[PDB]
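Reopening: structure tokens for the sodium ion complex, inputs below.
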Amino acid sequence: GMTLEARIEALEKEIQRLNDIEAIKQLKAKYFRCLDGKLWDELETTLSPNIETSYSDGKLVFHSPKEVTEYLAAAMPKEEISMHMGHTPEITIDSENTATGRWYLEDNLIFTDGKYKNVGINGGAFYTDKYEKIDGQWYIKETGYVRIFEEHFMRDPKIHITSNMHK
Amino acid sequence: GMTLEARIEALEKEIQRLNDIEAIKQLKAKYFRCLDGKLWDELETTLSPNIETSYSDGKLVFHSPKEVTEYLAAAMPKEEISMHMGHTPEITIDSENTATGRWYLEDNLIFTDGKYKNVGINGGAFYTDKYEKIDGQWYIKETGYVRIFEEHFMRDPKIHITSNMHK
Amino acid sequence: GMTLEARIEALEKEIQRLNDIEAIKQLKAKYFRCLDGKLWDELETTLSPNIETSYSDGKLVFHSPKEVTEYLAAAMPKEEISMHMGHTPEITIDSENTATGRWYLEDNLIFTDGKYKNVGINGGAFYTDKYEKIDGQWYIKETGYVRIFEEHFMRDPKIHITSNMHK
Ligand code: NA
Ligand SMILES: [Zn+2]
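Re-run output (same inputs, fresh job):
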């Protein structure tokens, strides 16, 4: 049936897809690691320079990955321990340089100091991301979510936090 | 040594395996997303028409994916927030159209209304699934588990749930 | 441009990388499953015979996978329910037989009996592992971490544990 050339072409396309899926999984992994490590300069490298600006009365218009990370740093201050835990991705490669990804998030936040001292926040969400490939590298272009649930409460003050990377 | 044809054949087999593993990971991802989103019609599409009926005095015999989802809907009512979080899969492709998968589950359930209002249930489990491929698509054929642990308790009624997709 | 031989060689290298990444993901999955199942003999099979001995005044020098599992068994006794939950791996294949992996850990520990009866411990950590390939199989060579946070507390004694695989 098919020539060797045709069989090779098909393999090259299939492998490129698998390589792209794996790169996008590591991209999102790096995003969560840097977000929760508060490694803002490194986090910035996961964001597309063309990161999508979702339009709405009262929301911010971001002009750059740097502005996005300035917002995240303000939203995730030193006093806030965060864990953003990604599960069970569904990655679809839409074209040579675009992709979509679903991620199942669990998040746990603990405020250790300041106005929200001893507040805990837990929740879950289904994210839907868009990614884009620029010069052989994948970036996050747009990231949105539907909350499963979210809750807040006061932690028992007797809970002993014995390690905190942000201290 | 090997002819180009032989090297290509080997690549085609290896790539088919990786494609099948990735499809099975996205299959199980879709299962959890739809289960926790209570998207029962969509959940049904993840189940094999030949879904295995585990025989035991007092258990139900399912005749179709639809009957399985009717049971799940009764087991996971609107008043129950659920998170079924899959980790660290071990997927083995057993033949061209069959596979086995191990998944590490964490689950968190919260009842918001009705008889179990303010009950929380947490646990963990090791699942072992069987999958089957029909017309180029993977389906869940059988799904079983060993519980690591399970616990229940009354939640502090002062916990503020601020978002709930089921409301 | 490239000969068919060159295109095949490239595919073989790319596929070997993807196969190695998937094998390393299943390796770490098996590690967590056996650690939390307290399946010490099986856990041992995930560890390199050349498992790295991190040098420090007061620490143990391990001579074998078996000694490592003896330590883990002492550190994770029957009375301790553990869940070590791996997320969002970043696996890099460094050479034909070496690799590095980042994993995002959440851990939850519950003591059911003995000196720490009713103690809970929760936390998170970023692991950085080294792996090595011996006779076609990947093994864990070195495993280290930075804690995000760790906390301990007394559980409400009214929490009903209804299943425990270690009982
Ligand atoms: Na959790
Ligand atoms: Zn998790």
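Residues A 85, 87, 106; B 85, 87, 106; C 85, 87, 106 surround zinc ion (ligand 2) (CB under 6 Å). The longest helix of chain B spans residues 4-37. Marking as resolved unless the reporter disagrees.
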